Write an enzyme that holds these catalytic residues in place. Sequence first.
Site, PDB file in Angstrom:
ATOM      1  N   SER A   1       3.882   2.753   8.262  1.00 52.81           N
ATOM      2  CA  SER A   1       4.102   0.917   6.949  1.00 52.81           C
ATOM      3  C   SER A   1       4.833   1.132   6.446  1.00 52.81           C
ATOM      4  CB  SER A   1       2.870   2.381   6.626  1.00 52.81           C
ATOM      5  OG  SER A   1       1.547   1.680   6.866  1.00 52.81           O
ATOM      6  N   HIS A  46       1.087  -0.859   0.260  1.00 49.81           N
ATOM      7  CA  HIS A  46       0.195   0.049   0.049  1.00 49.81           C
ATOM      8  C   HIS A  46       0.924   2.077  -0.252  1.00 49.81           C
ATOM      9  CE1 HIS A  46       0.111  -0.125   4.589  1.00 49.81           C
ATOM     10  NE2 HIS A  46       0.403   1.345   4.293  1.00 49.81           N
ATOM     11  N   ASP A  55      -0.357  -7.777   1.407  1.00 50.91           N
ATOM     12  CA  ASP A  55       0.272  -6.342   1.669  1.00 50.91           C
ATOM     13  C   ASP A  55       1.504  -6.454   1.309  1.00 50.91           C
ATOM     14  OD1 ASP A  55       0.255  -3.447   1.140  1.00 50.91           O
ATOM     15  OD2 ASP A  55      -0.541  -3.165   3.996  1.00 50.91           O
TER      16      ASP A  55
END
Lengths: 239, 58
Positions: free
Chosen positions: A189, A53, A98
């Site tokens: 992230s 992402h 992911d």
Amino acid sequence: CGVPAIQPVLSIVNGEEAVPGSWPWQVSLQDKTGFHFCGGSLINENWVVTAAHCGVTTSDVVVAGEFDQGSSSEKIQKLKIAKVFKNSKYNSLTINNDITLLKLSTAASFSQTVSAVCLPSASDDFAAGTTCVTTGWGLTRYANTPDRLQQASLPLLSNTNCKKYWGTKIKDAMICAGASGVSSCMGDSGGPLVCKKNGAWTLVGIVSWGSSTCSTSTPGVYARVTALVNWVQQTLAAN
Amino acid sequence: RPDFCLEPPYTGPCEARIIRYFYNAKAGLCQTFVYGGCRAKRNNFKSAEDCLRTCGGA
């Protein structure tokens, strides 16, 4: 891999500042202007593992050996990205699978502050309750990111306990940790969630998603590396 | 203009720090905001120009 030249000192929202260079595999993913948008982990001198992402492209750069992003004098390695390998199974709706691999144009010069994290075996079993660590330059309060690398110790959660909150949003390539007073947050992230395996720090998760306000009492969700490592090895072998 | 242009910016549940643009009807211009990387709503653009071409005047 998994053995820092500079030992970290243990004991991200409510985390603590890390000993400079004690998490040598931690990298900062930045755009051409130097803007940090995601973290990552070096798995060897030519590859970085991060989240899908994060949307990394070949125009972005990998910054290794960094501690204080507010220090213009600090010695770091700005590495160009030759190719981006997004896992084709990444589900942009459920956020499952992911993970993305970044192949560097020029290899990273490993040193006291720059080295690789170990990868687990697909069959590895990291028991719930295991105390692991996550690191990054994400928000420390849900606001600008902290200049200095942060860290936080947190426990892995069983899927049953995680689902007690997130229900069916938890998929097979996800693993939860946290809800213990700390929390990964915006800017973390792609970063690592590491646990020791026979004394060596091993990548068990990749910061993915969680509480929309980075609540420290809610389970944090990470990409489960054991469920994606075969894809990683296959990608490295073919490239 | 589309009603999605009137929705406040949506960061989402993912934890990235990605710069995106959203149309601010109160100001009449597109502004920047931090997008988490997943589950973007429609008032989320990669450039101020795209945003203004889609939501300008809403």
